[PDB]
Every structure is written in structure tokens, then in C-alpha cells.
Design a binder for this molecule. Structure first.
Ligand SMILES: CCNC(=O)c1ccc(C)c([N+](=O)[O-])c1
Ligand SMILES: CCNC(=O)c1ccc(C)c([N+](=O)[O-])c1
Ligand SMILES: *[C@@H]1O[C@H](CO)[C@@H](O)[C@H](O)[C@H]1NC(C)=O
Ligand SMILES: *[C@@H]1O[C@H](CO)[C@@H](O)[C@H](O)[C@H]1NC(C)=O
Ligand SMILES: *[C@@H]1O[C@H](CO)[C@@H](O)[C@H](O)[C@H]1NC(C)=O
Lengths: 537, 535
């Protein structure tokens, strides 16, 4: 070794690691990037569950982010920062099961609460190595141990022939689990407390957190959970065994493949890009907010549907922070609803609205679609292009995030959980999306990871203090199971969401504001009425 | 004897009576017959013009009330008895009443003609709240109210039969209108300026006079308060009218052959028919009536919905409106949990139970939709919100949303519409606080009753009453509720499909609101139909 920084050499079950000393605005942090936690799921291991990483020789260099799991690359607005920032920033490869660790520098004296991050990207995209998931700010400012993983996505993560040995489904979720076990065994070598692991994720990642809450084997690997704008229940996060089998079979046909063994084997001999190229082609209806290859109800990882499981399971032992952004849906409109674009005000007609509702709610019968339309129409101004545009966004937002989240907060709370809830209402001054999209899906993340503290990012000063507040919320929660600062009860208190009072707080530049009822009336429509209506057509 | 009280009409001579209003005398002519008594073999038949008479006919008292059910829900209680008949009951009831200034009007004066409510099963023009002396004395108006046959006697129908063809209660009204044309000029009334106005079943009657071509030459303007011809209660198909008449006949112990069926029904004391009146409804209901106008293809060429959807109303002027709490009055007449004597706090169970009764015709799924829409999900079980939501369901379903639909279709197809909501609860009111401003309690004020000192109304209620009296009569003179002399805004603007503007009648100055329960009425008018039509 000799001449290395001796605070960056660490040993884990797989061997020795050299990390890197990174600059954060307030001082240095330790980073161990590209730690392999599974055997590269390639060749005959494609579609298969992850195997633990076989131990290596020598010091593994862990100073750079590793490959991004093979995935679709968004080309809606090429070069535009707003979409490009989600796009993969390392090489695409099937060899991609690696995780990252940030810690204080030097590494902490006594055992430190751990935060594990699970990225979203609709189960078809995403990586732990994007700028918005930079653990350096949490680690430096809050002294946290931050961990984030890659997990397989798209076909490679979630293609399934349910019941088969060679493609049992959900292997991307099993990737996430393996990382959680890895954390248990190795995080104490970094000064992390493996008896205080808080998961947190966004969209698809929030959904993943949810499925770990609902899968028995995972529940012993963490103690608290944060779900940001995403749920295991709801219309997009899961599929039946039946529907997964249909999509898997169609994709096989689409790329050349005619018994499940035979079929899987031929899929294994296809180049990854040939699978990615045809991935969007197996959806049942012209839709938005629907993703082809997602977690499946197999009766194993998920013993029943998430709706069933939250309707029944016990949750006294659980502490959970959940919330949403103001304008969840607007982001998704430009990927399919005719009339929407980042480049104009997206003022649509009533006829574009009706057509939009059929796309936003692809599984709705004619009657149900009319019900949605009748509910979201403003009958004072039923043709006002502004009111229609905003209503369309609200339809997609409410159906896919806000009412699943409200139903989740509702069910958990009643069943013993300590639930804390927020709506995130601040539009980043640095936002590149148009004003009409409001506070769009995914743009709370930048503040929780604390990017505004990077002087060079041109955020405002009040935005700096704001990000500081959230980091305190998330970490206080992670430390205690409670967002509120213990010593600081002069500032307004964040109360738990109860079924009786349905309280939640506003997250904005102003101090905490307690609100009652989480879009209560409109979610009665989506959660109580609509399923009865589809179940009578 | 007094020459002002001496009027000659086509049929002969009348003696009226001089009455004291608080500010001066009025001339009243009460008990004027406009039709041959529909008794005996002429029961169920259309009315016929009154034969001429000798001598001077005494018209100084109210005549008999059309034979009808008498309410017994709260015996002795003013709140229900004030609707009960205040003269003897008879089938011999086709008589009308006329109030004019004293002395008689020098110039042809605009005429207001009033058509009572009572669900087409009750009512009389002699009720104290329909007293036309105040409008006559104060606004110098000529005011005319009629009786018309109600219940079985006015609306029992064996459609397509000679003997019980339906709608004769409406035809009674129409003959009274033909009478006003022919005779009102002798009282100083202007037959070229006749305004109809009525409440609930009366408002619906008015509605049906608008939608029936023969009536359209008998009036020029219309006021519909708290009722509409469209909606779930004011009409029945020919199929269902035939059903109820057949059934009532078997209950009364009759029988095929329409003729043989209506013949035996004619040989029955009136009470034997009224006794079984409520027993022919198809489901357990509230705000549903056994014998009402029928879509017979004659008086009503097609259904009221269909007719308002296609008619041309280009030179029509209409004043429509509701009270704040339409449904509350009706809850105590059959929804478990509700009462004049409690504060009617109800459980969620009782609320789901009441919706099946509020909306008797609804499928399982449709009632599920009602409950889910009216529940307050911040407070899903709070007995007060549930009670207030029950009242709102009945109100909205039966009055407010029919009104919004009519107001919309009329304005859209040429008509000039003025819309209101009445939000003042009478200080003299005998019903409990929880019912708020119940169905029926604007009439006291439109007719000017607060101007009588002995009624013990408050000073401001006297002042409010005068305002309403002036809206209504101004409307009668011009087709426009607004004073042409006061120069102070706000003004009462026309209801339009675009702006959906209406106003609030209460003690405070006029206030213009937009959207008459727009979101909720979309549910009832647009969605709910598509839903029953898929179960
Ligand atoms: C040209 C092909 N691309 C898509 O279909 C696509 C990409 C991204 C997203 C989020 C969605 N979506 O919301 O359904 C669709
Ligand atoms: C005991 C018999 N009485 C009735 O059925 C009745 C009387 C009045 C009213 C308004 C109603 N209603 O609401 O249908 C019913
Ligand atoms: C916005 O742009 C898209 C595509 O460029 C177009 O289809 C849509 O009609 C436009 N809308 C407006 C209001 O200009
Ligand atoms: C921040 O502002 C400076 C101008 O002072 C500019 O050169 C730089 O590119 C900006 N950076 C970002 C990320 O906006
Ligand atoms: C209201 O009072 C009546 C009078 O007997 C009673 O039957 C009814 O049960 C009462 N309802 C409630 C909710 O107290």
C-alpha cells in the first residue's frame, strides 16, 4: 500500500477497497464507488436471480461509478437538460450490479444510521450514479452513511415467465435485496449501524421500498422507510402473472423467439439492445405512465397483490414517511398525450382532453372514462384550454401517484404504522421545464440530497436553507422514526398522518403548514368508486 | 250597493267583496266558477266551460277545495296544517279567485296567475299564504288563482281511453287561462300581459304549459319556483300511469275494457280512492307521487326532457329559482332518523338507507355513486354532515338539478332566463333549525304576508318582502325583475349557459353568483343517466 491515504482503505466480505476523498462545500467526504455485490448477471445468468459476488484478489479500485444497467435511453427532447439529467451517465452494460457508499471523512467514530437509496425510472431505466443522487452532501452535512445500488431494469430486471425456473420474475427487486443483505454484513466496516437502516426511493424506487415492506424476507433488512411519489399499490407498479407472461411471450416473438426453457434460451442469445429496442412495443394500449416490464405478482416475492397485502398485513413495527409533489402528472403528458409539449403552453381543447383521458387511464371502459371526464371538468368553464390542460395533468397525477399514496398512508396508518406525510410544493428556480408543468415529478430529489448547497449550481440562498431543512427532516426521521428535530420544538411540529385527522405538511420556502385531508374527495373517486365501476363493465 | 264590486263576465254577473290590506282596500272576487262541476260521470274527464247564470252571483267567499289527501304526519302542527285544506272538500271545486286594486284599475293592468303546489295530490288557492290582497294593493297588480283537480281525480289516466285520458288537472288549469283571456279585461286586467307563476307542482304545471302548444297563446311570461316539468317526479310514462290506475282499481275492488274499468271507478266515494292513493307507488319513496301528469302524446307530445331539449323559446321570458334547503322538508315523510322534533343526527348506515329512498329508482351501483359523492371524506361519519348531505341529495336530485338543467336548456335555445336562490329563513318559522330554509317558505314573502303587522314578522322581513314583490311584479310588467328606475348595481343579470349567473335573495343586497351547483348537477344530469342506462 505504502503511500495511499490510509482513511480510504476498507475491507468488505469480498475483499479490499480503495475509495476516494471527495470535496463537499463544507469539507471532505469519503466515497466508495463501484462496489460489486453480485456475480455479473450475464450470459446464462440473464433473467436469473443474483448470486452473491465471488471474493476478489488485491485492492479493488472504488473511486469511479461503475456501469449502468442496460436500459432504454430517452430521446424525446435530445440535448435538453430536463430529460438528459435522468439519462445514463456511465457505460450501458448487463454487468451492472454495483453499489456506492458515501460517509463522513474521516469515517465516523461510533456506529452511524444508514440511508439506502433506490432510484426510480419506471423499472425500465435509472442509475445510482446520477448527479441528483450525490450522497456527498448528506454525508458531510448530516454525517450520514449513504448507500445506493444499481438493480437490473426493463426486460433484464422484470421479464417473467411466472412459474418457470429460468425467468421467475422480479429479479431486479432481488438485486435490491442482495444489496440490503450486503449492507447488513459490510456497512459496519464504514462506520454504519446495520441496526438502523432506512430505505428511501422515488417513483419506481418508492414502489420498490413498498414491495420490500410487503415481502417477508426483506423486512428484516431495514427498520424505517420513505416513499417519495410512488407506491407498491396502484395501476403501474405491478402486473398479474398472466399479463407478465403475455408481455414476455410477445417480446420473444418481436425479437425472433417461438415450453418456457426453449423460449428463454433463445432470448438469452439476443443482444441486449435488441430487447431494449422492442421493450415499449408490448403494452396492451396506447398509454402514458405504463411500463412494460415491472414487478409481477408471482406468489413468492409478492405473495398476493400489494392492494390485498396492505389491506390485511400487520404494521405496528413500522415507521414510514410518504409524500408527493404538487404537480405529479405534468411530466408524463409530453410522452404521449397529443397537444402537450415543453415548448408551448400546452393549451388543449376539450376534444384533446377526452382523447387524453383515454390515454392517461388506458384500462378504463367507455363509462369509466366518462366518469373521469365528468369529475375533472370544470362546468363553469368546461372548454377553457387552461383549465383542461391543468385537469389533464391532475388526472394522470391523481390516478398514478397521489391517490395510491393516499390509499397507502390510509391503510398503513389504520393498521398500526406511524405515518408522516407531505406535499412538496416548491418549484426549483433552476428548473428547465416550462412554468405550466408546475412542480413536476422528481424535482424534490435535488433538495433532499442537498444539491443547492453546491455554490456553483446557482440555486438561491433561501433554497439553500430550504434544502438544509429537508435533509434535517429525512435524517431525523432516519435516526429516530420522526422528522421533527428533538431539541427544536419552537418551530412548527410535523404531526403523524392519522385516519381520524388525515394531517400532512406543506414542504415549501415558508415554514411547515399542517393541512387536513390529502385530496380527500377526488381520491374517494379513484379508490372507492372507480374500481366498483370497472368491476361492473 | 258598491259598483266597484259589480262585474259582468261572459257567464253573468258577479258581486265581489271589499277587503282591507294594511295600506288600503282591495277588491276581491272569490269563488268564480270557470267550469261545470266535474262530478258524477264527468269525473276523470276533461273540464267543460261553465254554463251562463241568472241574477248576481255571490263571489265573496272561497269555494270548496278539490278533493284530496289531508296530511296527518304532524296533527295540529302549523308547519304542515298550513298546507292542509282550509275549506270543505268537494269534487265540485273548479272555481277561481281574482284580486284587483280598489278602485278597479283605470288602465289595463298586468295579470299574475298563480298555480299552487301539493305534489299533484293536494293544494288549494284559498290557503293563507296565497292571499293575493298584498300584491294587488301595493303593486297595483291584478292577481288570479285557480283550483284544479288533484290526486286521482285530476291525473288518473288510462292512456288512449275516452273516459280517463289523463292530464285533466292540467286541462282544468288551461280552461282557467282561457277564462282569463276571455274575461279578465272586465276587472281592468290586461289579457295581453299575463304572467304565470307557481311553486313545486305548480312550477311544474307552468313548465308543462310552456311545453304544450295550446297553452302558449294564453300567457306571455312564466315563473317557476322550486319545481320543473322535467325531473324524476312531475311526469310518468303511459305505461306506468296505466299500471297505477289498474292497480288502484283492484285495491278499490273494481273490475278489462277501459270503459268497464273507469265506469266502476266512477261509482266510488271520493275517500275510497284517496284511501289507497299512496299504495300504488312502485318502490318505497319520498318526493314521489302516485298520480301526476302523464306523457300521453297529447298535452305532452313527448317527455319534458325531450321537449325542452328541442323546443324554440326565442320570445319566452322565464324566472326560475330554488330555496337553500329543498330536500329537508321531505325527509320527515319517510326517511328513518329524521324528525321535526330531534336534530336528526344520523349514522352512516341510516344515510346509505336513506339514499335508496331518496333515489328509489337507483341501482346498487348508482346509489353507491350518490353516497360516495355526498360523503365528506374529511368527516365521513360526522352525524351533522350526514344529515345535511341527506337533505342535499333529496333537494339536488328532485329540485335544484332539474332547475339547473331547465334553466340551461331554455337559455340555450332562445329564452330569457333569470335565476335565483332564496336563502332567508322566516323568523316566524315553526320547523326546527336543522331544516334551514325549507321547500315552500319563500311563498310567504313573494305574496307579501310580512306587511300584515299582526303576523309578527320583523321590520326587515317586511322590507325584504317588498323587494321580492317588486321583483316579481316588475318581471310581470316587463319580463325583467329589475327596477327601471333605480340606478344602483348590482343588477339581476340573465342566466346564460356561458356565465351561468344567478342571484341570492336574502336580507342582504343582491349578490351575483356563478354556477348553480354546477359540479354536483353535472353528476346528476350528465353522469347518473349514463349509469342507470348501464345497469
Ligand atoms: C418513443 C418511445 N418512448 C416511450 O414510449 C416512453 C418513454 C418514456 C416514458 C416515461 C413513457 N411513458 O410515460 O409512457 C413513454
Ligand atoms: C302516510 C302517508 N303520507 C305520504 O305518503 C306522503 C305525504 C307527503 C309527502 C310530501 C310524501 N313524500 O315525500 O313522498 C309522502
Ligand atoms: C404544442 O406543440 C405540439 C407539438 O409541437 C402540438 O401538437 C400542440 O398542438 C401544440 N399546442 C399549442 C397550444 O401550441
Ligand atoms: C451559473 O452562472 C454562471 C454565470 O455567472 C454561468 O457561467 C454558469 O454556467 C452557471 N451554471 C449553471 C449550472 O447554471
Ligand atoms: C327522532 O324522533 C322520532 C320520534 O319518535 C324517533 O322515532 C326517531 O327514532 C328519532 N331519531 C333519532 C335519530 O333520534
Amino acid at each position: 500500500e505504502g503511500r495511499e491515504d490510509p482513511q480510504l482503505l476498507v475491507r468488505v466480505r469480498g475483499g479490499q477497497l480503495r475509495g476516494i476523498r471527495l470535496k463537499a462545500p463544507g469539507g471532505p467526504v469519503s466515497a466508495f464507488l463501484g462496489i460489486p455485490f453480485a456475480e455479473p448477471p450475464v450470459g446464462s445468468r440473464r433473467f436469473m436471480p443474483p448470486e452473491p459476488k465471488r471474493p476478489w484478489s488485491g485492492v479493488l479500485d472504488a473511486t469511479t461509478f461503475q456501469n449502468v444497467c442496460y436500459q432504454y435511453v430517452d430521446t424525446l427532447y435530445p440535448g435538453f437538460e430536463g430529460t438528459e439529467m435522468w439519462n445514463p451517465n456511465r457505460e450501458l452494460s448487463e454487468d451492472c450490479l454495483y453499489l456506492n457508499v458515501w460517509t463522513p471523512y474521516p469515517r465516523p467514530a461510533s456506529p452511524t444510521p444508514v440511508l439506502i437509496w433506490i432510484y426510480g425510472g419506471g423499472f425500465y431505466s435509472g442509475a445510482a450514479s446520477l448527479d441528483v443522487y450525490d450522497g456527498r452532501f448528506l454525508a458531510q452535512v448530516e454525517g450520514a452513511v449513504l448507500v445506493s445500488m444499481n438493480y437490473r431494469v426493463g426486460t433484464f430486471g422484470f421479464l417473467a415467465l411466472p412459474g418457470s425456473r429460468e425467468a421467475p420474475g422480479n429479479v431486479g427487486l432481488l438485486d435490491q435485496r442482495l444489496a440490503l443483505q450486503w449492507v447488513q454484513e459490510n456497512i459496519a466496516a464504514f462506520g454504519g449501524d446495520p441496526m438502523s437502516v432506512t430505505l428511501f426511493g422515488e417513483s419506481a424506487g418508492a414502489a420498490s421500498v413498498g414491495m420490500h415492506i410487503l415481502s417477508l424476507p426483506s423486512r428484516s433488512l431495514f427498520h424505517r422507510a420513505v416513499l417519495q411519489s410512488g407506491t407498491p399499490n396502484g395501476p403501474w407498479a405491478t402486473v398479474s402473472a398472466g399479463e407478465a407472461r403475455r408481455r414476455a411471450t410477445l417480446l420473444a416473438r418481436l425479437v425472433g423467439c417461438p415450453n418456457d426453457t426453449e423460449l428463454i434460451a433463445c432470448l438469452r442469445t439476443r443482444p441486449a439492445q435488441d430487447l431494449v429496442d422492442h421493450e415499449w412495443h408490448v403494452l396492451p394500449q396506447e398509454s402514458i405512465f405504463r411500463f412494460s416490464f415491472v414487478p409481477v405478482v408471482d406468489g413468492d416475492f409478492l405473495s398476493d397483490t400489494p392492494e390485498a397485502l396492505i389491506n390485511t398485513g400487520d404494521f405496528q413495527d413500522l415507521q414510514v414517511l410518504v409524500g408527493v409533489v404538487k404537480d405529479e402528472g405534468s411530466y408524463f403528458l409530453v410522452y404521449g398525450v397529443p397537444g402537450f409539449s415543453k415548448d408551448n403552453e400546452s393549451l388543449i381543447s376539450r376534444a384533446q382532453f377526452l382523447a387524453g383521458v383515454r390515454i392517461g387511464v388506458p384500462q378504463a371502459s367507455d363509462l369509466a372514462a366518462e366518469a373521469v371526464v365528468l369529475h375533472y371538468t370544470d362546468w363553469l368553464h368546461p372548454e377553457d384550454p387552461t383549465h383542461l390542460r391543468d385537469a389533464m395533468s391532475a388526472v394522470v397525477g391523481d390516478h398514478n401517484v397521489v391517490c395510491p399514496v393516499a390509499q397507502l398512508a390510509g391503510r398503513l396508518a389504520a393498521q398500526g404504522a406511524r405515518v408522516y406525510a407531505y406535499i412538496f410544493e416548491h418549484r426549483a428556480s433552476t428548473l428547465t421545464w416550462p412554468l405550466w408543468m408546475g412542480v413536476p415529478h422528481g424535482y424534490e430529489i435535488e433538495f433532499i440530497f442537498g444539491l443547492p448547497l453546491d455554490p456553483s449550481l446557482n440555486y438561491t440562498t433561501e433554497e439553500r436553507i430550504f434544502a438544509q431543512r429537508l435533509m434535517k427532516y429525512w435524517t431525523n426521521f432516519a435516526r429516530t422514526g420522526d422528522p421533527n428535530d428533538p431539541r427544536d420544538s419552537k418551530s412548527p411540529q410535523w404531526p403523524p398522518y392519522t385516519t381520524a385527522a388525515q394531517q400532512y405538511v406543506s414542504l415549501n420556502l415558508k415554514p411547515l403548514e399542517v393541512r387536513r385531508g390529502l385530496r380527500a374527495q377526488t381520491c374517494a373517486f379513484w379508490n372507492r368508486f372507480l374500481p366498483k365501476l370497472l368491476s361492473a363493465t
